[PDB]
Write a protein that binds this ligand. Structure first.
Ligand SMILES: CC[C@H]1N=C(N)N=C(N)N1c1ccc(Cl)cc1
Length: 155
């Protein structure tokens, strides 16, 4: 039904960034075999296509890599995903803002960490978002901060 979802990691103040193992497993299991959409910035920091996913890059500037699909438009990106149940929007503060109005599902990782930056996740007023899932984790040997997975559905 071409549900668009957003998956993000947030620190306090909704601060986001590009460059915690458990969050990588969570990210990987919720995007596996789903087409993913991202900004230049986000593409540039991974370097590799994400395996077994249609990688789609949203940018005004022209393409530099044939392994991934390039688009200049929110609607060009959605159409490039084709007939799939769920589209995963994975990154760009700017890309998250462009796709929140078209999204029904949110996959958030709340990390108990201070981070200095002005890249913030978009305000999602609680009025029309319902929280359906919630999972806290202490810090352990592999994960340096406590963190909490959350999934919200649009009311
Ligand atoms: C640790 C971040 C990772 N984790 C979740 N849960 N969601 C994301 N959006 N992540 C992500 C962030 C930036 C880039 Cl470039 C790629 C992936």
């Amino acid at each position: 039904s071409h549900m668009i979802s957003l998956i993000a990691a947030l620190a306090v103040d909704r601060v986001i960034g590009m460059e915690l193992p458990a969050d990588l497993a969570w990210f990987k299991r919720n995007t596996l075999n789903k087409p993913v959409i991202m900004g230049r910035h986000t593409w540039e920091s991974i370097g590799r296509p994400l395996p077994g996913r249609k990688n789609i890059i949203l940018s005004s500037q022209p393409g530099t890599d044939d392994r991934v699909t390039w688009v200049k438009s929110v609607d060009e990106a959605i159409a490039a995903c084709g007939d799939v149940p769920e589209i995963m929007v994975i990154g760009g503060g700017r890309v998250y803002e462009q796709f929140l109005p078209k999204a029904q599902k949110l996959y958030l990782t709340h990390i108990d960490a201070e981070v200095e930056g002005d890249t913030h996740f978009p305000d999602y007023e609680p009025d029309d978002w319902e929280s359906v899932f919630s999972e806290f984790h202490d810090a352990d040997a592999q994960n340096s901060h406590s963190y909490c997975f959350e999934i919200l559905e649009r009311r």
